[PDB]
Design a protein around this ligand. Structure first.
Ligand SMILES: O=P(O)(O)O[C@H]1[C@@H](OP(=O)(O)O)[C@@H](OP(=O)(O)O)[C@@H](OP(=O)(O)O)[C@@H](OP(=O)(O)O)[C@H]1OP(=O)(O)O
Ligand SMILES: [Mg+2]
Lengths: 763, 149, 505, 154, 112, 273, 42
């Protein structure tokens, strides 16, 4: 009845090695390994043999019908909707055996059927498959390609030769996708006919500190770290090692390491250079960081101390860069008075009050303090800003929020995807709507002409954005050089206009070189679209150009001598809107009077929001919500805990840092008492076993204070691993055990209610 | 009336492991009086082949380990291969409660809570010499130092 | 269930007639919808019914200096006043002296500054609204402790470098195609091992499928047969008769440990459970519990800001993907012993001492001694519970000479605006005419359901795969689907506006 | 309270919207980057100016690629780790209460339950407790239900 | 781990300057010199599927290094045993394969 | 309860020595300060300051000596390798416009003469837009200047980078270059499409256009769907080069369709560990 | 090859400061805050 007090007088386990529930399965996490594909096919064969004969073994062997069943019936990957079926032939036989002739293969093989060898080669079948996919003739009667260049490649022009399968799959009619293109050319081999792309290859997950994850196993959250390089990720190959490093600049590291990189906990002392992702001007010789390390950076909780300046920081770090809540102290008067020969008790009595009054508790964003540019009042201000709108807009946008939730709840998945596509396009058009209807013009004398603005551009896009980058408001980013303030020291005119004119010269030379190299190859033969237009992202211009030319006077003369860009029209939209008014019974005079009451009363939201529906995952905050006092106290408390655990890696016996940096009053090395069997000079009380208990501790009170503190920390470590069998009522473990027993009883009751419901339903 | 009971038990399950919200069963009396007893000694263990192979795999991972321990001043002591650990155990310098570290661990643990360390240490000669040293050297010295001071 | 701090923010005597699912997100959603509904009702009721700020410092400065006391400062003032009235003063501004001391504030900024002056001097759901926006901002702050995107590269931000080194600065073992390529290559020596494939026909869709592997003598049957042999031999390698000597040695070795160290699977599961509940109990004793946004932190992050202060196993040697089919590593697999390098235990005696204290320390050593940082933290927790017009004239006419009225400036601008623009026009017409000739080649020989580009079709299919519903088939998205979705969106917006207009009568 | 009980919580709905937006935006950005790399490769190869080789190399930079986030799963874009919940076994051992009831009912009565009676059984069983039993990973009492089924009787 | 044990001669040449101590501190991913063309060295059938590397682990005190040749592949169990299978080649496929596997290597998880 | 959860202890090892003020043999934990350990020694009343134990600077020879042993490395030496310099200053490309993919706009909607007296002062938001456009032309003149682009193989060094983001990186950053990507020839085609329309391709286009009722077809030029077979398979040569496809007949539902008439060296792989 | 790039951290800090006090609808504080930051650069 009591699960926590089962009788352990017989302990026995019945589990085999290898365990069949762990061995005979392919995991979903094993996607991206080709041997897993071979193993999945073999496991399907095992299941088929089990359901036929009760064992994982065939009666004779692998048959031909197992191969057909594996190729056709087992893997049945999902395609698009099938094309309209044809009932009559649209071609006629000209010579003999020109065409292939007009229950499944597996059950034909089961009922007696042999597979003998055909005489045609593989390239003929793949050519026929490509012709059926394109639905057009891809070779002529003489054997020469129609849609492909039939001359050998010009080696001096920079070209190489291509086979027809590569060309007719990489250049294809846009209603053929990559997977049926691979199927038509018989791309089958798991190891050599497949390559991973650069954007789709597997990588370890980034998890940061590792908090806030979804646990696959609720009792063991650490199992969710298994696909990452977190320091507590289970089984990372090589063990974490105790590293003691002296660098050539005399920076030293001591603590845990992963593949020789500081990546767990430890202590770094700074030499003439720098370390742990700190900037070069932050450190001096002999400064110290203690705490958490990830990938060589100070990352997590820690303490920075400088003896030279007296600065102490306790708090959070992100990538070596002082991010989050922190406490700052100035210990310089105490250190200064200690350096001039004052004993520490008298020095503390002189300096403690002035040190305590100057403690600072703050929020840091990225190496810099917050709270001087109104960061603590921004959220409230934005709330008040939403109250300064006219009432019609407020009522309308709240109604929009409710209606958007209601219609998203009722959508199909395909409707949901198309809705998000439309939202993305509306987000894009607020920065570049295009110039639809104003790319080309037809002036007098016919003569189609391009439409340019005052700076010669036919589009709003500029490709110098890819190098420098742009901001949220459309301003260009920082360059290679620059003044500190571009409003205090603007660029001198006569230089701005001279460089603008020379920039137009560069643009003209750009168009000339690109038209020389790429302007001759044809992408779309029906519209006259070429590679220079296509690869520059100007297909919109080409559709407008075809439409404008076909209605030009030269266009109609050429056409009878031989003999756009919008989904909806304005009139249809106005008709739909006018129809949609009269369903609700709203005349236009109702809109006139609502606009009258709106006119009589004459970035919308929280900037630090978490889940905005309209996002590009690109707009950055340059602040956070500032820490209150209890959060700062909690993180200082936890950081001191972390600093104690980090200082446990500080003197590796016979490590390099201890051998080189532990010195006497002169520069001479000392023999540290760290040897495991010898306790010299009356220090046998320090031994942790029974030999230490029978020896006398000296009568210095501060040493006994220190020993009591060390014993307290050891008991705190001990209680986390050793537990009582029968805990006394009134203790913490008794409370925990009572809650565990209650959890089992409640789950059993809920299970009994589902069994009652199942017996009621099945009747 | 079962529906009221089921909703109350579901909301009880929702806050059961909230450690800051008190529960009526946290200090309830046990059914029998407490009389705090020890777990009985199991005296008979039959291992599965799974357990045998897991012990062998762990022994393979731990073959090349160099150990370290802490003393009563929280100072780490010297490089300890297995025979140095055996010498320190026999001499009484360390015991099963001493904090240790080796490869495979993130932090310092007592020796009894580190898997397979005590079976590696406790050779029959080691057990006999540890008993000799405890009985005839350290306990008379402990009684002498208790009487003398 | 809503806390005491929320309960004094909303107006009281509200009755709840329905049971809401437990959790913080449902409570906060209900309060947020309540604030929304009250503001909507207030603005509907309000719509159905019937300031020049100056600067103290600049005004004091410009009153301090005097013209008119002599002809020199008077003439400086006259010159500046002439030029400033010509170019600096806009027609709707009424005086130069008035706008030189005007604080040029926008309408919303001066309204908010009046409101903040009114607040510092001395509605319905405004404090509740402010509280809910604070906890939204705190959730955005809490995202830094987990996985996040870093899609903006800026000067001074070291975080994307940390992400790149975390994802690529270490080797993670996984048997990809890259790993199989780096281990063993074919080393051909007699030409290619693979050859062109031979189709088969049977003797008793659009695409002809490959039937070359419908034989037991092919390459695929060989690969399957090789995998089957490897499975059989891996199982035979661990049969008991083959492992017998190992079974002796381990039986000696594991019997050197004390008998109380052997545990049942239920016992090791129970000890694991007790370990993490003891961590939760210790987490309830920190300063984090006095935060206003505590229990938003607790349900998203936990009771601490570090994983190393929680309960975890010591599994830091060996390789995860080599061990995956051999040993269970988490309890949510079957009832097995998990592979670990640490063991929790039951106490096998009564702890008469504290087990780590020396005997001489047991006489009155109960210190709790405190240093400087401890005392400062305790104190903070207890606190918790002439010549101007001439200079301006010179600067103004010098700037007016620089950026206006400069003929070399005008020359560079006009070459830019006219000559190079018509050059770009000429090259654009030349490229246009080449494209038109290429089009007329097809036009000379000639006698809705259109799909989108490949990027759009792939984006739609990947989101449908992430929809969470049972996986549907691939589709080819057209322009009719896109125009239907756009019209549905615009219909929803127009209909909710007409509903509000019907409420406004 | 009626809107919250109908399931129109803003947190879940906007999370689904942001996941779908992240997937579509990642695909569109990858395709545009592919077209630009193709253009610079052709200008370098058939044109002969090696500045376009350097532009193609700058577009192919690892810091730029993992800054764009194209190699990480899009769940990570909305702050969630990718999970594999079907990899864990679905037996009697640590199943949910409804699923474990289906396996108790499916042990005896040798007829494996189809979809419609399983749907009816779980619907009625959830109707008994008012729908307050945990169904998601973010629901509180997920940990309590996991603790309550962790012990195998013998 | 002295610096002169790893010093190479003449930048463009990646071979060690001191060949008398070149056996010390070798990783399993270091290249084997017996695979150079023109060398008539021993036959090493235990390494035939990992022929470019020195595919064994003989490491000391705390100097083990593992990069894409894992600890389990180098020195554990059936992974190590299966990687060295070319040592045990002698020097139809339809029916006799399963019959020989049933008669020779019996196991109840397949054959029972 | 105390503020500290754990006790803070000094964690220093002990040693024996002479005290000089107590004038006694003493066990203590007082070690020399880290602000001057390693820089100096005092083996006499006179003091030796050591001349080179911490390196205080770095050139190319000493960087080549200590390349894998430093805790940091700076931009000052890493300018002169282009992949490293791209790691320090990457491209700033953000906020993509998808001009290749967005081809339509859902709704449709010339040297004018202007007198100065009819013209209103401009609002401060569009004024900013004009300044932005001029700055983009200035940026093109600084960054993509072709007089420098033409002489960049052999006379000058003009590479496209973004702004410099960091001055110092951790030394193991070059490990992110270890798993190489493919050469672009292995991703894209090396051959152009057709530059002219012959007679047979015009016949094929007319047949295809007749099957689709003048809606025609659109085409796309993408990357490869597979690697090329001749590097891992023996292929039949087909030395005349003529294909003759093998398939079933075209379908519908005169109007009848007609065909138009008139030892091995090994590579060095990149996708390797 | 000595193509020069400058480290532009201070310009970025000024621009961030302007954006931060423009988000808080108080650009009347801009000259004093930017001036004291430029003084503390010195
Ligand atoms: O060049 P024109 O065709 O003679 O145009 C001029 C003149 O232009 P310019 O002085 O630049 O040559 C003025 O135009 P603005 O200088 O004001 O731009 C003028 O305006 P005012 O006489 O009022 O100064 C007026 O333009 P408008 O026709 O708008 O009055 C006028 O044209 P007229 O030939 O019609 O006088
Ligand atoms: Mg945004």
């Amino acid at each position: 009845t009591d699960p926590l007090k089962e009788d352990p007088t017989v302990i026995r386990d019945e589990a085999q090695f290898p365990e069949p529930s762990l061995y005979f399965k392919v995991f979903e996490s094993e996607a991206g390994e080709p041997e897993a594909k071979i193993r999945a096919d073999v496991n399907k064969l095992y299941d088929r043999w089990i359901e036929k004969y009760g064992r994982r073994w065939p009666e004779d062997g692998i048959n031909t019908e197992d191969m057909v069943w594996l190729a056709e019936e087992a893997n049945k990957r999902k395609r698009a909707k099938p094309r309209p079926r044809g009932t009559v032939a649209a071609e006629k036989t000209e010579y003999e055996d020109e065409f292939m002739p007009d229950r499944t293969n597996y059950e034909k093989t089961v009922a007696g059927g042999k597979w003998v060898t055909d005489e045609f080669e593989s390239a003929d079948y793949e050519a026929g498959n490509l012709e059926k996919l394109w639905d057009m003739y891809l070779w002529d009667r003489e054997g020469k390609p129609t849609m492909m260049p039939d001359t050998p490649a010009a080696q001096q022009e920079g070209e190489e030769s291509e086979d027809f399968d590569d060309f007719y799959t990489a250049y294809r009619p846009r209603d053929v996708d990559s997977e049926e293109a691979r199927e038509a050319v018989w791309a089958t081999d798991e190891f050599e006919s497949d390559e991973d792309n650069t954007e789709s290859e597997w990588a370890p997950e980034y998890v940061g500190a590792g908090l806030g994850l979804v646990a696959e196993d609720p009792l063991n959250p650490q199992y969710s770290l298994r696909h990452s390089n977190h320091p507590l990720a289970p089984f990372p190959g090589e063990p974490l090692k105790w590293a003691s490093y002296v660098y050539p600049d005399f920076t030293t590291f001591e603590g845990l390491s992963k593949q020789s990189i500081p990546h767990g906990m430890g202590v770094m002392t700074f030499g003439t250079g720098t370390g742990a992702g700190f900037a070069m001007s932050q450190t001096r010789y002999g400064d110290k960081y203690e705490g958490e390390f990830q990938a060589g950076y100070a990352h997590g909780l820690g303490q920075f101390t400088s003896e030279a300046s007296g600065e102490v920081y306790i708090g959070e770090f992100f990538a070596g860069q002082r991010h989050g809540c922190g406490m700052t102290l100035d210990m310089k008067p105490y250190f200064y008075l200690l350096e001039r020969g004052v004993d520490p008790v008298e020095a503390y009595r002189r300096t403690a009050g002035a040190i305590m009054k100057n403690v600072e508790v703050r929020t840091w964003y990225r190496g810099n303090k917050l709270g001087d540019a109104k960061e603590d009042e921004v959220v409230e201000i934005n709330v008040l800003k939403d109250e300064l709108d006219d009432p019609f807009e407020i009522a309308l946008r709240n109604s929009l929020h409710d209606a958007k939730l209601r219609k998203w709840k009722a959508m199909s998945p395909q409707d949901k995807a198309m809705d998000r596509i439309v939202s993305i396009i509306e987000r894009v058009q607020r920065r570049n709507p295009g110039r639809f209807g104003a790319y080309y013009r037809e002036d007098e004398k016919g003569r189609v002409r391009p439409v340019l603005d005052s700076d010669g551009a036919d589009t709003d896009f500029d490709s110098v954005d890819m190098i420098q980058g742009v901001d949220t408001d459309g301003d260009l980013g920082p360059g290679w050089e620059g003044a500190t303030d571009s409003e205090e020291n603007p660029m001198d005119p006569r230089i701005r206009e001279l460089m603008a004119a020379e920039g137009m010269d560069d643009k003209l030379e750009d168009e000339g070189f690109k038209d020389t190299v790429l302007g001759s190859a044809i992408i779309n033969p029906y519209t006259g679209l070429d590679m220079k237009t296509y690869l520059d992202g100007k297909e919109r211009h080409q559709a407008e150009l075809v439409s404008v030319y076909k209605a030009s006077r030269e266009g109609r003369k050429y056409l009878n001598k031989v003999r756009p860009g919008a989904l909806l029209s304005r009139e249809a939209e106005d008709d739909r809107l006018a129809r949609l008014y009269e369903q609700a019974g709203v005349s236009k005079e109702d809109e006139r009077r609502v606009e009258g009451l709106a006119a009589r009363w004459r970035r919308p939201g929280n900037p630090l929001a978490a889940n905005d529906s309209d996002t590009g995952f690109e707009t950055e905050s340059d602040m956070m919500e500032m820490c209150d006092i209890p959060e700062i106290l909690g993180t200082v408390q936890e950081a001191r805990q972390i600093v104690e655990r980090a200082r446990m890696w500080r003197f590796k016996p016979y490590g390099e840092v201890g051998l080189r940096m532990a010195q006497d009053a002169n520069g001479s090395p000392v023999s540290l008492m760290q040897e495991p069997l010898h306790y010299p000079h009356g220090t046998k009380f320090m031994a942790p076993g029974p030999l230490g208990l029978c020896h006398a501790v000296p009568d210095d009170p501060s040493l006994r204070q220190e020993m009591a503190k060390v014993a307290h920390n050891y008991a705190a470590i001990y209680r986390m691993y050793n537990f009582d069998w029968d805990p006394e009522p009134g203790t913490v473990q008794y409370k925990i055990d009572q809650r565990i027993r209650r959890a089992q009883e409640l789950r059993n009751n809920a299970m009994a209610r589902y069994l009652a419901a199942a017996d009621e339903v099945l009747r | 009336t079962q529906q009221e009971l089921a909703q109350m038990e579901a909301m009880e399950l929702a806050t059961l492991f909230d450690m800051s919200k008190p529960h009526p069963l946290d200090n309830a009396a046990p059914a029998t009086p407490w009389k705090g007893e020890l777990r009985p000694v199991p005296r008979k263990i039959v291992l599965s082949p799974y357990q045998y192979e897991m012990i062998n795999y762990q022994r393979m991972l731990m073959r090349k380990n160099i150990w370290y321990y802490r003393d009563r001043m929280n100072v780490p002591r010297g490089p300890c291969p297995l025979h140095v650990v055996k010498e320190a155990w026999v001499s009484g310098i360390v015991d099963e409660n001493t904090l240790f570290w080796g490869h495979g661990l993130y932090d310092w643990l007592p020796a009894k809570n580190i898997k397979l360390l005590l079976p590696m240490v406790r050779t029959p000669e080691v057990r006999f010499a540890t008993w000799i040293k405890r009985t005839f050297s350290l306990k008379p010295s402990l009684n002498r130092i208790r009487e003398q001071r | 269930v809503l806390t005491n701090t929320q309960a004094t923010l909303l107006p009281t005597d509200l009755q709840t007639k329905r049971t809401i699912k437990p959790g913080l997100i449902y409570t906060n959603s209900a309060l947020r919808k309540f604030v929304r509904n009250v503001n909507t009702r207030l603005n509907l009721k309000l719509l159905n019914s019937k300031q020049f700020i100056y600067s103290k410092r600049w005004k004091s400065i410009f009153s301090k200096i005097q013209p008119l006391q002599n002809g020199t400062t008077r003439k400086s003032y006259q010159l500046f006043r002439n030029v400033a009235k010509q170019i600096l003063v806009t027609p709707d501004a009424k005086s130069l002296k008035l706008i030189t001391i005007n604080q040029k504030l926008s309408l919303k900024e001066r309204k908010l500054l009046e409101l903040r002056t009114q607040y510092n001097n001395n509605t319905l759901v405004r404090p509740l609204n402010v509280y809910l926006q604070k906890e939204e901002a705190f959730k955005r702050k809490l995202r830094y402790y987990g996985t996040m995107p870093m899609r903006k590269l800026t000067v001074g931000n070291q975080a994307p470098y940390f992400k790149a080194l975390m994802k690529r600065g270490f080797y993670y073992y996984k048997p990809t195609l890259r790993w199989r390529k780096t281990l063993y290559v074919a080393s051909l020596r007699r030409g290619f091992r693979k050859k062109s494939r031979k189709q088969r026909i049977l003797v008793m869709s659009l695409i002809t499928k490959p039937t070359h592997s419908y034989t037991v003598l092919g390459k695929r049957a060989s690969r399957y047969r090789h995998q089957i042999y490897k499975d059989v031999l891996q199982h035979w390698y661990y049969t008991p008769f083959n492992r017998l000597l190992m079974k002796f040695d381990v039986d000696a070795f594991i019997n050197r440990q004390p008998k109380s160290h052997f545990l049942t699977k239920n016992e090791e599961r129970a000890l694991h459970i007790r370990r993490f509940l003891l961590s939760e109990h210790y987490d309830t004793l920190r300063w984090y519990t006095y935060m206003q946004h505590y229990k938003t932190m607790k349900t998203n992050i936990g009771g601490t800001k570090s994983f190393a202060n929680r309960a975890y196993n010591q599994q830091f040697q060996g390789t995860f993907k080599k061990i995956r089919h051999l040993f269970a590593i988490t309890p949510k697999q079957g009832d097995f012993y998990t592979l670990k390098f640490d063991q929790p235990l039951y106490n096998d005696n009564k702890l008469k001492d504290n087990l780590y204290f020396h005997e001489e320390l047991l006489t009155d050593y109960y210190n709790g001694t405190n240093l400087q940082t401890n005392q400062t933290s305790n104190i903070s927790v207890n606190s918790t519970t002439n010549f101007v017009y001439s200079e301006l004239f010179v600067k103004l006419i010098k700037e007016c000479k620089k950026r206006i009225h400069d003929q070399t400036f005008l020359k560079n601008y006009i070459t830019h605006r006219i000559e190079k623009r018509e050059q770009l026009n000429q090259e654009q017409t030349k490229e246009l005419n080449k494209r038109l000739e290429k089009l007329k080649v097809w036009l000379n020989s000639d006698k809705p359901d259109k799909v989108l580009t490949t990027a759009m079709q792939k984006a739609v299919n990947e989101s449908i795969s992430l929809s969470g519903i049972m996986p549907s088939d691939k589709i080819k998205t057209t322009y009719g689907n896109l125009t239907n979705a756009y019209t549905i969106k615009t219909e929803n917006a127009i209909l909710t506006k007409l509903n509000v207009i019907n409420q406004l009568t | 309270l009626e809107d919250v009980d109908a399931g129109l919580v803003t947190d879940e709905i906007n999370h689904e919207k942001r996941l779908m937006t992240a997937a579509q935006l990642r695909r569109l950005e990858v395709e545009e980057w592919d077209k630009q790399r193709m253009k610079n490769f052709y200008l370098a190869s058939f044109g002969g100016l090696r500045w376009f080789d350097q532009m193609e190399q700058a577009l192919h930079n690892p810091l730029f690629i993992e800054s764009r986030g194209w190699t990480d799963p899009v769940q990570n874009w909305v702050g969630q780790n990718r999970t594999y919940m079907d990899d864990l076994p679905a037996g009697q051992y640590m199943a949910g209460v409804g699923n474990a009831a289906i396996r108790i009912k499916e042990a005896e009565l040798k007829r494996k339950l189809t979809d419609v009676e399983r749907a009816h059984v779980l619907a009625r069983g959830g109707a008994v407790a008012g729908g307050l039993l945990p169904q998601q990973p973010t629901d509180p009492a997920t940990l309590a239900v996991a603790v309550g089924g962790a012990f195998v009787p013998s | 781990q002295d610096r002169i044990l790893n010093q190479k001669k003449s930048q463009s040449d990646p071979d060690k300057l001191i060949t008398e101590t070149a056996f010390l501190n070798l990783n399993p991913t270091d290249k084997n010199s017996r695979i150079r063309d023109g060398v008539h060295a021993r036959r090493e059938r235990w390494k035939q599927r990992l022929i470019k590397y020195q595919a064994f682990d003989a490491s000391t005190y705390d100097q083990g290094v593992y990069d894409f040749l894992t600890i389990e592949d180098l020195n554990y169990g059936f992974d190590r045993f299966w990687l060295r299978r070319k040592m045990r080649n002698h020097q139809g496929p339809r029916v006799e394969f399963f019959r020989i596997l049933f008669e020779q290597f019996y196991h109840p998880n397949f054959h029972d | 309860k105390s503020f500290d959860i754990t006790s803070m202890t000094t964690t220093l090892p002990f040693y024996a020595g002479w005290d000089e003020s107590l004038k006694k043999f003493v066990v203590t934990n007082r070690l020399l300060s880290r602000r001057d350990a390693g820089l100096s020694v005092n083996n006499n009343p006179q003091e030796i300051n050591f001349t080179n134990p911490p390196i205080q600077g770095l050139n190319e020879g000493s960087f080549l000596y200590w390349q894998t042993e430093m805790p940091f490395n700076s931009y000052n030496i890493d300018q002169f390798i282009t992949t490293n310099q791209s790691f320090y200053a990457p491209l700033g490309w953000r906020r993509f416009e998808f001009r290749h993919s967005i081809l339509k706009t859902w709704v449709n909607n010339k040297t004018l003469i202007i007198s100065l007296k009819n013209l209103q002062p401009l609002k401060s938001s569009q004024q900013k837009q004009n300044q932005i456009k001029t700055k983009k032309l200035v940026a093109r003149r600084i960054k993509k200047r072709y007089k420098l682009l033409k002489q960049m193989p052999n006379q000058l060094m003009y590479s496209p980078t973004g702004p410099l983001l960091t001055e110092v990186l951790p030394s193991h950053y070059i490990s992110v270059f270890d798993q190489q990507y493919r050469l672009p020839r292995n991703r894209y085609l090396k051959r152009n499409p057709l530059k002219t329309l012959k007679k047979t391709t015009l016949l094929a286009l007319m047949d295809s256009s007749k099957q689709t009722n003048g809606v025609n077809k659109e085409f796309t030029l993408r990357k490869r769907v597979k690697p090329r077979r001749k590097y891992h398979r023996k292929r039949f040569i087909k030395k005349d080069g003529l294909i003759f496809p093998r398939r079933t007949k075209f379908n519908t539902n005169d109007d009848l369709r007609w065909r138009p008439s008139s030892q091995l060296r090994r590579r060095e792989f990149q996708q390797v560990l | 090859g000595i193509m020069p790039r400058k480290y532009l951290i201070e310009k970025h800090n000024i621009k961030v400061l302007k954006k931060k006090l423009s988000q808080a609808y108080s650009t009347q504080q801009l000259t004093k805050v930017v001036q004291e930051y430029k003084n503390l650069i010195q």
